[PDB]
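quick one: 2-acetamido-2-deoxy-beta-D-glucopyranose bound model?
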Amino acid sequence: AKQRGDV
Amino acid sequence: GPNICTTRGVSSCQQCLAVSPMCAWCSDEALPLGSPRCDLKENLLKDNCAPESIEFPVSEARVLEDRPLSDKQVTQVSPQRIALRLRPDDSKNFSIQVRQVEDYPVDIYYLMDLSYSMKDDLWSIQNLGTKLATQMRKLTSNLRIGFGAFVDKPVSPYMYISPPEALENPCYDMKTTCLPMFGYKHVLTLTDQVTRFNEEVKKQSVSRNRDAPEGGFDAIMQATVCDEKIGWRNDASHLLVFTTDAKTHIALDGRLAGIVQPNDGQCHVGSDNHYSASTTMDYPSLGLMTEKLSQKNINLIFAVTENVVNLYQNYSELIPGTTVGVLSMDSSNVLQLIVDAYGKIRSKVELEVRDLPEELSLSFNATCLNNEVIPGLKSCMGLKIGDTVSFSIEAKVRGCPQEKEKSFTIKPVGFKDSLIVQVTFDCDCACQAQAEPNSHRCNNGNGTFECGVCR
Amino acid sequence: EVQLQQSGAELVKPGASVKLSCTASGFNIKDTYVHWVKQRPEQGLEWIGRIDPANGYTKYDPKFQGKATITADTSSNTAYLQLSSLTSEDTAVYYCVRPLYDYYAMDYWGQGTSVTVSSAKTTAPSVYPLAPVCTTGSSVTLGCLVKGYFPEPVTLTWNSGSLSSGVHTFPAVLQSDLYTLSSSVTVTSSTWPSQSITCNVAHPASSTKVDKKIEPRGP
Amino acid sequence: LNLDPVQLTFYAGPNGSQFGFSLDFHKDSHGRVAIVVGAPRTLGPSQEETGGVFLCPWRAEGGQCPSLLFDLRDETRNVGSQTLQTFKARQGLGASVVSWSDVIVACAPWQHWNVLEKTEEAEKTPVGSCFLAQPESGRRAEYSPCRGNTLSRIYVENDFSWDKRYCEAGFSSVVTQAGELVLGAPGGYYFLGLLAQAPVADIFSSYRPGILLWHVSSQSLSFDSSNPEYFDGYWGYSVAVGEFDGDLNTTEYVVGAPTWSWTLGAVEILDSYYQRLHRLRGEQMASYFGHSVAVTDVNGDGRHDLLVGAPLYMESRADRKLAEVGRVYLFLQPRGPHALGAPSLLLTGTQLYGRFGSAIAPLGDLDRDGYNDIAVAAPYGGPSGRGQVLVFLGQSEGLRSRPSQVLDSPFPTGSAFGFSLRGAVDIDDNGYPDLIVGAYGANQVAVYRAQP
Amino acid sequence: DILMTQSPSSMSVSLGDTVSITCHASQGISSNIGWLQQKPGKSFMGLIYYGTNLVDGVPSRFSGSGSGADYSLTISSLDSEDFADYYCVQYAQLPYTFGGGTKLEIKRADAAPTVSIFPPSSEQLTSGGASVVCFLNNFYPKDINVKWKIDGSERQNGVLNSWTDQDSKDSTYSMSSTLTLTKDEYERHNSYTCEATHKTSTSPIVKSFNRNEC
Ligand SMILES: *[C@@H]1O[C@H](CO)[C@@H](O[C@@H]2O[C@H](CO)[C@@H](O[C@@H]3O[C@H](CO[C@H]4O[C@H](CO[C@H]5O[C@H](CO)[C@@H](O)[C@H](O)[C@@H]5O)[C@@H](O)[C@H](O[C@H]5O[C@H](CO)[C@@H](O)[C@H](O)[C@@H]5O)[C@@H]4O)[C@@H](O)[C@H](O[C@H]4O[C@H](CO)[C@@H](O)[C@H](O)[C@@H]4O)[C@@H]3O)[C@H](O)[C@H]2NC(C)=O)[C@H](O)[C@H]1NC(C)=O
Ligand SMILES: *[C@@H]1O[C@H](CO)[C@@H](O[C@@H]2O[C@H](CO)[C@@H](O[C@@H]3O[C@H](CO[C@H]4O[C@H](CO)[C@@H](O)[C@H](O)[C@@H]4O)[C@@H](O)[C@H](O[C@H]4O[C@H](CO)[C@@H](O)[C@H](O)[C@@H]4O)[C@@H]3O)[C@H](O)[C@H]2NC(C)=O)[C@H](O)[C@H]1NC(C)=O
Ligand SMILES: *[C@@H]1O[C@H](CO)[C@@H](O)[C@H](O)[C@H]1NC(C)=O
Ligand SMILES: *[C@@H]1O[C@H](CO)[C@@H](O)[C@H](O)[C@H]1NC(C)=O
Ligand SMILES: *[C@@H]1O[C@H](CO)[C@@H](O)[C@H](O)[C@H]1NC(C)=O
Ligand SMILES: [Ca+2]
Ligand SMILES: [Ca+2]
Ligand SMILES: [Ca+2]
Ligand SMILES: [Ca+2]
Ligand SMILES: [Ca+2]
Ligand SMILES: [Ca+2]
Ligand SMILES: [Mg+2]
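yep, here:
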């Protein structure tokens, strides 16, 4: 949810 | 009143047979002078001709090779060899059975998302790949399988471009190592070497980029349109299995990297096996993807993680024929899509004749899955593995060829198997064998005496 | 109009803490870096540190690390400087500062907050008149000596303010915890002692006002 | 209806420059109208692509234009124990251009920026920048609201909040009548997208060369969000301004977010504090609803209407088949404090892959009948696919479904004719507003004059 | 840390003069320098940022120059309001550091001090203390030295001095010196002397009194 990158 | 056998010269037994299949010749010396020697067999016997002395060849068909049809070498045609013996102008029928035993050809090309988000999914996509290979190989011995991988367009802002070390190692700032970023990489051409495919799939590791949506649609387009590179076969079922755990870049996204040139729908891989236009050409649109998938007859399967299933289900509705499965630690869901696809494959049996002599002509009756004799037909459709159809062929000779021994082949289109028909032409009578060179009875410069007659 | 409004003068004891404040007026405190700077007469200007009030991140000169804590509250549009373990070296004027355009500059300053660190108790001054010695010229000089008060300030006038020309009132100086100040007044010899000259000294902290008429010395 | 397609005027830039990617009319203090043209791949003076801007004086015969000079040298500043760096190579100067009063604002959305501190860095990223010019004086200013001096590690420790490193500020732009520059930055906040607003006057008065990081006190940026509907939405891919709350003292912003909500797309109308007043959702995923937005009153009632382009919209056809043609949605503003409803009209492209709705330009009143008109570009439309621009006249009902006129590209395949458009200005002073059309692929601009 | 050395520490100048103040940094600071002004009894106003840029509102007579490690503030045609303190600050590096400052003083003709000596008051003598006060008033330039003697012998401890700023009206300086000793010691001596040394004379100005002599 939080992170919006390629993770 | 009079028949053709008696009213056409008939100076000899050989001429008698040549007139018509219904003609018979009498060699009986006790037969009186009034009676004709060339006649219908009924007439000869009625006129007291000795039954043993009557010459009346019957055309026949003998099976020489009759290996039965295989279940589960592979015999798909039965019989394999027949001997046809024909008298002048006669015909003879024979039967052939054809079975679809061999497995249907299927091409699977596997696209691996090797972006950093896929680190926790890596085992799952390796598992799925090797399961695709191993299990579909059990489903069909004519599987070919290959793969490629993608991340995204290797250009800012998708690509980390600082510090200089980040280019060869995108994970540099996390104090770990991953592979350099790349667009689309063709790794393994469609092959039947399953053990090798499984080895290469297990060697794959992840790279890393910045933004969540990835460049898999570039990979799909290229996997579709690069025929020679990927290795799709003309008469095979084509399945493109695409994996990811994220949303995907779409046409007009490329402008954020300064890329405005529309996708041209052409192959741009070439000899280093990278998509060369990755940094210069925009992502493809759904419509263009649809056009090429259809034009190349490729079936797209989205094998995606549960967080994005709905997304891809929704794209799937905009690319008709596309299906979606769930990528997970379990391969069943995706495998069923392939098995289902395989289950829909149908085949035909279309007989073709090779090396048929000028003098011979054939006619066919097909008995297909409906179990009804369709006369004139020499092909059946809608078969599955295990189904059998049957044909009745009738060969007719034109007169008596001087060749006397010929042969032709009846072969279903796309089968190794065939029926070899050996043809012998039987124009002579048996009584010719003991022709007695010295005339004895003629004695006027005629010579020889056979079947109760002079020249 | 950008204006940094600092809190009032502080009188505080050694070993204690004090917290100064700086309220933004005509702008929002989170707009820029806010710095704190210290000024002393002898040692001059020293940068203490800064805060980004948008996120609370701080930098400090190592000399003040552990003594100074800078904070900010965007709700009240105020920056703060807290000084712990107060010593005599912390007696100084403290300014908050922000740039105009350049992120890194030091362009707008508050009015300053004076901090005095002392153990002294409030003490009223002793006020002494200073008449000349026993030939007289054309002018004469008288004086007033204000000794031993705390804290500053005292106000000193002559003749209740009516004598302002020819006055030199010297800045107070601190001798052993208390302040001393002096003043001189010069007039023509025909003015004094013929007319009354009186020193007026007020020390509000001790609630005291004292008048001292300068009288000629006698035999 | 009455744009002359025979007597065209052509302006041209250098090969490969993308001259025509963006354009606008510029009126000097004397009132003379010229044409500003962006050319984002123009080579700088050291043979590296930097982009550039040209200012074309009106001439019937057209031709070559003078290059409006900007500084193309990279800057470095060692300050505050940090090293600030601007990188202008491949910055795309002229990817957008807009004129206001006597000012030209040309943006470079892919200008890069880094900050170094010992062994750490901010990351070298496309913050974007805009260059502001006042031609009649020579004044120059810049505005780059997304530059920061925060190191990489701090974004990581704060879950990448308020991350403006990939803004691409100036990707889109518009200026209000009062002189507020509004910039779209679709990469803002880790690709949610953001808007940056500042008065032009304050941009000029606060800029000095070499400072690189400076404050514009009057500036106002939109906000970060934890709503996943907004993730990768590219909010600010397109931007426009208009009057949508009935209060003439306030200006409203229109913002395109073409990949909003998992590529459904959206356009939002907002107040100048960035509070949402209305949201218009896209109809079909990946259609790029919000690629273009235009504001103009088309039905003569004095209330601004909204047009939205979805250039990759796929139309349904026989036997469950879909054809990418593009679409344009017309929303007429109703009376009173009421929401915008469903579209009053849908215009749909006819050429496969034509990208109808890729650009939409208010023309003003082309035929002088009392109703304002529009032009819609299909840059790969027409039977040949060379590109087409379609004129629709306004009426009491809104717009006509049938175009009054079709302009076919005069340039060869690949020109992207119509990718940029501007009208509503009378360049030759005949009393009728004219149309300028960019074909960046052919490095040219075509000017069509309206006739009596 | 970067050392900022500012010169001169003061200057005596006139209205209408053009003057320069220099700042030398211990390393190159590439124009990351501000100039600041503090008027008497006031806070600071910023004059220049980033080497040469005037803060909004600042008069055009102020200008900045320099590069590398060496910079200058120039004031063209001094106004009365320009007699103040000026400082440089660098922000090339944290910690920010300041120059020691420059005071602009008003130039005038030299003037000798008027010196006045005062014995202890009777009120003070009753308390047990004795302060002898000497005023050295209205002199120029500012530098001056005071020496106390009791019966000819130089007396150093217990002397407290205070100096005024430059006078608003005549631009002179004044000084106060107080010698405090015990009443006990005070009454053991006769002669009390304050000697002022200033550039206006080679010999000191001596003022004296003998205790109890009227
Ligand atoms: C492919 O399959 C077809 C279908 O089975 C098959 O066709 C047979 O082909 C052979 C020759 O190759 C034919 O043989 C000839 O038969 C002639 C007599 O035919 C008539 O009589 C038939 C029997 O009728 C009775 O029984 C039926 C059913 O029980 C019933 O309906 C009737 O009422 C009646 O009681 C009858 O079926 C047949 O009907 C066919 O023909 C008519 C006319 O064209 C047509 O209208 C029908 O629709 C139907 O197709 C017909 O009424 C016989 O005279 C003939 O003999 C002469 O020629 C031979 C040489 O060819 C000489 O040796 C001889 O001396 C005579 O001169 C010959 O025997 C047979 O009739 C076909 N049967 C059918 C049903 O069509 C093919 O062989 C198959 N092909 C292969 C490669 O396997
Ligand atoms: C893939 O595609 C699907 C199908 O299009 C999307 O799912 C739909 O999402 C839309 C929003 O885009 C939903 O629309 C909402 O419907 C509500 C009523 O639906 C009821 O009935 C359905 C039956 O299918 C139930 O499943 C559902 O739970 C509801 O009980 C409305 O109440 C909503 O109105 C509110 O929002 C709209 C703005 O959209 C406002 O205009 C209204 O005033 C109000 O505030 C809304 O219309 C819809 O429910 C979804 N359909 C289905 C079948 O689930 C997916 O989102 C999409 N996914 C991805 C990843 O792309
Ligand atoms: C084939 O011909 C033979 C004649 O020898 C006949 O008995 C048989 O019914 C025929 N079969 C078919 C399938 O035509
Ligand atoms: C642009 O390039 C083409 C070839 O790609 C060339 O023919 C043409 O002359 C070039 N334009 C100019 C102005 O030189
Ligand atoms: C509009 O409102 C602003 C405050 O929001 C005010 O300053 C301005 O005067 C108003 N203008 C008019 C014409 O009412
Ligand atoms: Ca994952
Ligand atoms: Ca990506
Ligand atoms: Ca409004
Ligand atoms: Ca309207
Ligand atoms: Ca009109
Ligand atoms: Ca015109
Ligand atoms: Mg990923």
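The first strand of chain D starts at residue 9 and ends at 12.
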